[PDB]
Amino acid sequence: SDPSSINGGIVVAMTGKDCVAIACDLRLGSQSLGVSNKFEKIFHYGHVFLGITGLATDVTTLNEMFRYKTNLYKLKEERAIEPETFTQLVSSSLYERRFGPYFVGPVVAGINSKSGKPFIAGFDLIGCIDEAKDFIVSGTASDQLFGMCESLYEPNLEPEDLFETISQALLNAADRDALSGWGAVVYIIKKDEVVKRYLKMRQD
Amino acid sequence: MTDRYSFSLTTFSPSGKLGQIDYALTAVKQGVTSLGIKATNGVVIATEKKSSSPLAMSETLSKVSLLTPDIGAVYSGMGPDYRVLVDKSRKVAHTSYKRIYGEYPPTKLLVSEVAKIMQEATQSGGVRPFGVSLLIAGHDEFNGFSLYQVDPSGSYFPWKATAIGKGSVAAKTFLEKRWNDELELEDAIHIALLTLKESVEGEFNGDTIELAIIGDENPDLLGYTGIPTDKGPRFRKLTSQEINDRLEAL
Amino acid sequence: GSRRYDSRTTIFSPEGRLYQVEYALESISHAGTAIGIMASDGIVLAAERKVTSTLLEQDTSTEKLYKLNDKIAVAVAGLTADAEILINTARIHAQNYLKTYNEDIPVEILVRRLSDIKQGYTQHGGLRPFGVSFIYAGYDDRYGYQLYTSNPSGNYTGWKAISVGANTSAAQTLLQMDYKDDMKVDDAIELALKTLSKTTDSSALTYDRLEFATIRKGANDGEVYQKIFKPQEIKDILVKTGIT
Amino acid sequence: GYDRALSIFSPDGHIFQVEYALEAVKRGTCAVGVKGKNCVVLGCERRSTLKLQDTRITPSKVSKIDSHVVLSFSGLNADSRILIEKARVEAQSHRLTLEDPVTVEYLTRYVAGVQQRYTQSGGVR
Amino acid sequence: MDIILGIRVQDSVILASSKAVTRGISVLKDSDDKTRQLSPHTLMSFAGEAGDTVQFAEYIQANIQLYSIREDYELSPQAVSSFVRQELAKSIRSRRPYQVNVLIGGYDKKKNKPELYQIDYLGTKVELPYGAHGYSGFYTFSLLDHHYRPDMTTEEGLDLLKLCVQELEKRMPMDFKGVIVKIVDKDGIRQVDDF
Amino acid sequence: TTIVGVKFNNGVVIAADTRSTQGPIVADKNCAKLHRISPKIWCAGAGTAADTEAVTQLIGSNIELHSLYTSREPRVVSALQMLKQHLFKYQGHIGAYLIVAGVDPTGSHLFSIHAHGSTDVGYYLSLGSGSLAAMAVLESHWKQDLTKEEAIKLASDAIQAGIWNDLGSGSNVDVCVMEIGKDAEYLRNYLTPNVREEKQKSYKFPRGTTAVLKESIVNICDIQEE
Amino acid sequence: GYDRHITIFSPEGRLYQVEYAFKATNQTNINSLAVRGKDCTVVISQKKVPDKLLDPTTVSYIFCISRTIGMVVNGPIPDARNAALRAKAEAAEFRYKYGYDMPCDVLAKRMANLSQIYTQRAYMRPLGVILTFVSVDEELGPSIYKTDPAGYYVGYKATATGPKQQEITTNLENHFKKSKIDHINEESWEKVVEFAITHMIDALGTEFSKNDLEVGVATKDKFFTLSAENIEERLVAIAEQ
Amino acid sequence: TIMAVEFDGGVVMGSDSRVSAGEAVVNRVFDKLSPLHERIYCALSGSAADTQAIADIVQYHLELYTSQYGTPSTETAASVFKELCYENKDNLTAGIIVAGYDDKNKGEVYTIPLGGSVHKLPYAIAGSGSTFIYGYCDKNFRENMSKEETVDFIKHSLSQAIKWDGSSGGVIRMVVLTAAGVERLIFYPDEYEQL
Amino acid sequence: TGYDLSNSVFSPDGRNFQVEYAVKAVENGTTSIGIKCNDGVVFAVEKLITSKLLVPQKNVKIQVVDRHIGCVYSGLIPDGRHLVNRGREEAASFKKLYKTPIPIPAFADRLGQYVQAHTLYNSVRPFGVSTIFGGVDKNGAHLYMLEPSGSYWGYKGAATGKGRQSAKAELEKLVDHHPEGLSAREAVKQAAKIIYLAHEDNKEKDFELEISWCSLSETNGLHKFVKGDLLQEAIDFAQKEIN
Ligand SMILES: *C(=O)[C@H]1NC[C@@](C)(O)[C@](O)([C@H](CC2CCCCC2)NC(=O)[C@H](CCCC)NC(=O)[C@@H]2CC(F)(F)CN2C(=O)[C@H](C)NC(=O)CN=[N+]=N)O[C@@H]1C
Ligand SMILES: [Cl-]
């Protein structure tokens, strides 16, 4: 009944020293029933990464919508949208449906191509922006993700340390939610190279 | 009643001309001279404040207008047409850009939107084209300093320097001699004032000349302090006094 | 009432021609020449900017060659501002088809749509047609490389090599003479510039008067690249071919 | 909306816009249809004033409306697409509501209806 | 309603769909085909509210058949599924949403690969080696998790489905009056007339 | 949320706590509630965070355009009027509660606005979960003829009351001082009285600690030439 | 030659309908004049009652738009009244929407843009009127803003409109070329009206009785017109020096 | 707590100063008397939003009327309120008293309760506080009282209503509408509580 | 030329010839008048008897607006009825919102702006009537005359249609010979005289006099038709002055 917890799943993002990480579980359920082990929740438009939790139809629709919007942005601006600007585009786009919202918990992560500054941001379903320095969490195991992150996280982590921290924050958060897990992906993002890792986690 | 003019008032003549756009360009030719010079570190746009009466306070007529904090426009031709275009231009920078992306549009895209409004007036039912040519100077973080010209047709082009209206043909030839790619802003102001002297008949002082620059950020013109990344507008209208100081080194 | 001032932009001549279409075509014949040449390993677009200045900023200037998506570009002949209205509409069909089917639009579908819009302005509405002709250079996985043209009438046709704008008669005759089916993109580039070089109303063809773009599978492996050539690159390709 | 009566009568009972439309069809490339005992053959001229064309991707003169009905034409090609699209849609609409493909007479009668409507609607030629 | 299964094997996709149509305390029909050919290499099975099921099935069919005539070309299963999903995702925020769940089984003639898509009435799409809508999944998913292999032949695929129907005839409360089984391969769509 | 506004001899000051919350959880420990409608007109918001942020930006935009069309510094009464007619039209469904404060040609102003479209004038105001805590301090310590220094103290003390005694409020004190004939000065993290102490332990792990199934490289770049 | 009937460009780049609207302006054969004092803005107009059957009290071309803004119209009354009713609506709407009194210059701009539309839109004719707006604005002080059928507007130290404007304009220029200030250096409005009427007398070479004039005065909050008796007091003063 | 009383020299309007949200006092010094014209006031009771939105509109309607037809009659101001309050009765919680001084009819008081009916009365009381003073007002009102008498009658009345009503308090503001113009009176706790 | 073929087109003179042609339709009509008296207004019109088949006193031309306003016109009768129908809507909408019956100056500008609106577009024809109307409001008696252009003014006396010059002379005399003012009962007689005198320019067909009046004393500030004895007494006084 509560649309934000029919399909289940989680996204987390973190800033480090001249890098960011964004990670998500792979589950898609219909409540108790697991349906898919391959439902990725992290998409990318140029160098800007978007994670989306909540009702899966809306996850898909918003990804299709932001691909559309960033494609036209690039044809008219003759450059790739930057994380700060995309964040405003997500917030605008969600607030347009104020009285019929997309049941989603979006998370933006990426490095500014001109300032080299690592950037993350989260949103409620009507586009209120949360621009924490440290970390952003979203999904059915948000409570848990807040607990893991707030204890595990320290600033200015190197990409290979940050990978460990965000992986351990997601894994241990997911093992304590019935509607998350079933696999996980972590993106380590530097100014001009992006490593994608699939995690070994329990399949229950 | 009802606007029963649902058909184009601009149509192709057998010669393949669009009469109403050509005639619009004629009205722009009659208009007072305005020019734009692009430096390495700024852009200058200038025009003559042709005062209709001496009783008239020419200060209360803005021929040079701020569109965004980093973009200004000047014109030649029909002042009323220009005024309502500045209104629509300022509002479209908000509705079709700033309210979506949370930043002011880059010069080429705001120009693009002004261009679109002018095109629609050559094809929409029951209207004539706009009788103006705009010079739009601007700065954005990814394109640097730019200068564009916009014609009644909707066509727009980027210039290093140019002039429109009355004494354009002569003024363009004068800029071609003086313009190099190393010019500092002050050098481009000094040339803008020379170029404008040729087309003016009567007085030539800070009360008959309107001149704005797109240069460095003006924190003193922001209105508030406490956000480092907000450094103030790049657009600045020069004062009567500021123009007159530069006319003594002329 | 109003009727007194209505041109009637969508009527037939006694001969069965559409006035406004024929006159818009006349308009396009005075616009800078645009050439499309299709090779086995890509498509060349080449177009001449109309009597420019020395003070026109050429490196931030686009009057002739527009990107529709990552696979398709157009060359414009006619009213730039009219062309920008259609390009923005075509750009949105391309992004609607990609949202609906999760596949990049086949070139001939986009071209049919822009041609159908144009056709509309010639049968209803009472408005003037768009004074614009397009060369569509595109790649999709059904027909490979495709060159199209559309004109105010909203009619479209496919081509191995084609010209629009000024002196097409003169340009068509030179292309008809030196085109061959087994031609390659480098050979096509050279053909494109030699054509403009002779059909130009200017004294000499120089970089500052040209816009140039190649759609190549000259992209690393089974994918397609669009190259909108920079001023300096046009200047290099003018020396290579030996026209300056 | 543009309401103007473009197809009107003339003092000698002629609708000139309809007659000038027939003149556009006279100008069109030739089209022929010959029905045999157990077949119909559509034949279409291709003016050879256009060479360096691409015959793979150029719109072919014969259009499939459904799997059993085709439409060839003379006149403005740009006009013919609108009629073909309207016929192809009605063809699927008929299958969906009658659980049967259109008859050739039904499809013809539909397209002819569409052509008639554009002779006494304001704003349209 | 209630029983639509799909299994993608090596070189085909197999859709199995219940023959029962039950209104109230009567089984009105025991031979119902809960499927529509969208194109020669794409089959769609459907289950959900009375009326909505067929109105949605036939509507999608008519659109795909229109696309096929207009382009004289057959859309990929991926393209058809994306079209279908977006229709549902649009419906879910309508005055009266289409209450219909579909499996889309297609052979992609370009990639020479069978594909199964599972989409729910919200417009929730996933590509699966095997899928089911409603209660069936509660039995058949864990069953297939054990017995499935990617490189199974169509004959093995059919034996694996027989296992699924038997398990459902044992442990489901309602009598779904057997399944109609259809194979989507490189040669198109054919019905298995003995199951 | 705890927001206050306090008028003084030559202007108006506005203050807010820096905590944003999803239910009982803290999302943003150093959030900024102090928003700018025009250069010299600031407001602060409680209720639906999105709703207050949308409504500030929409009225900020329309005020910027009005200021350009009229060639005048914008007035607070204008921001006030626009806000109240928008919120009233939407019948409370736009959950925006704002203290609006500015300096303009007419002088210094202080207004509140509630989601239904009611407005309020005064020399001191409070809003949010923390409003009763703030108003206790304001009612105890407010006098006529406050100086700039006294009004900032009184504003921050009123936010502090909220930080300590209200669970809905916490972290830092943000201030903005709008004085007549002067630029607005926005003192982001004015007071910083809730810094987390050093943790007993680093939880930096040893590399290799996580089990990986598959690595790969992702192309963020556009398709390359040649 | 239908580019003379509607508001489309002639080959010379001209709108003939705007030009013929300007001519409509002088049809009433009245001259108006506006000057600024220290605290006040004074507008005087010729009042001509040809018919004895008319009730003279109703014959006016001066309108009270809001409490602070007065408007005098040079043109035919039906168009003048159309402009008056629109300016009243707009100065009322502005106050409701933005919580302060519409400034003189802003309403000038707003009436100007409306006029600009009749010049670009074909189904709408230009209004055959020149609108002179006067106030004591709370930001700008004594203010004069004038709109015409072209959609032009500008601010004025002083201004004159009507058949003999060139003579009133020049008479006024001469006086400011002497004083070397942008206004009538006078503490009371009664003496700014006396200056207004005196300088219209010297410029039209005509004397006036109380029923030959119309006078509006705009002070810091209130714009009022004078009675015949109020003007007679002002005429007597003039004569006595 | 709000009332208007028509006396010899003109009319007097009086109110408390309390805005409450539940049992919390949001503002203890609000001004509930709002000018519609120069010598036409309203006293507002009900929703803070609903009364303000209405009063703003009536201001605008009379400003427009003044521009066109000069000074409107107190009756005309009452009619504008009635028209709004009657046509929007399903979404308004607003009880209004309208008091005015012209030179022809002199002091007039109109009351507009929830329905949007209009009642011309020698005096009107309204708001939550009024219930407690129907007895006191009825036994103490006379026609043709002086300014000093009418201000006193209203001071005492609202004094009682504040004492007994939790939804009323603060200062008692009044507005005196005579030929001479508008006079603003304030009375503080210390002055009225000891009555 | 061609400037007179389309309404709302300025000639090079700065004139709107379609409006000036409407005035001709007006000048072609029967004579109607207005006389402002001490506490009220009196309307009167010439009704040409085309045939003995016209039922006397039946084809009434003077129309009431609300209960206090008289309207009479000359020109195209249907155009006038269309203008009164609008007037009734304006007077109904003003009473609805403001409670008070519409003041006469306010009513006049409601007609003014409406007629004026019919000179703004080529899609409408101007009105083919000059209209004479007025009554008693809170500020006393007002008489107005309104022209196809939208032009209107206050009048001591008004006249339009074929006999207007004649009537205007007879009115001009009364204004000069009654500075202290006329009484409503006096104005009813004079009205009859000025219609009989203005009938000289229509002297072909014999006519049927029609008077109406609003007077604070004589009708309580309500519009009433003059009927029976008071009409006969006026027709008598009128017949005596021409002989
Ligand atoms: C005398 O009889 C007075 N008694 C009090 C009264 C309530 O009857 C009232 O009408 C006052 C005075 C208003 C003040 C504004 C100008 C018009 C007169 N009415 C209120 O104070 C009003 C009462 C609501 C129920 C009658 N209060 C509010 O509207 C307050 C204002 C607000 F902002 F805070 C919001 N609010 C609410 O009531 C809303 C609905 N909030 C809540 O219910 C919960 N809290 N929140 N947010 O004066 C009489 C004349
Ligand atoms: Cl509220």
Ligand SMILES: [Cl-]
């Ligand atoms: Cl405007």
Ligand SMILES: [Mg+2]
């Ligand atoms: Mg789990």
Ligand SMILES: [Mg+2]
């Ligand atoms: Mg499990």
Ligand SMILES: [Mg+2]
């Ligand atoms: Mg599903």
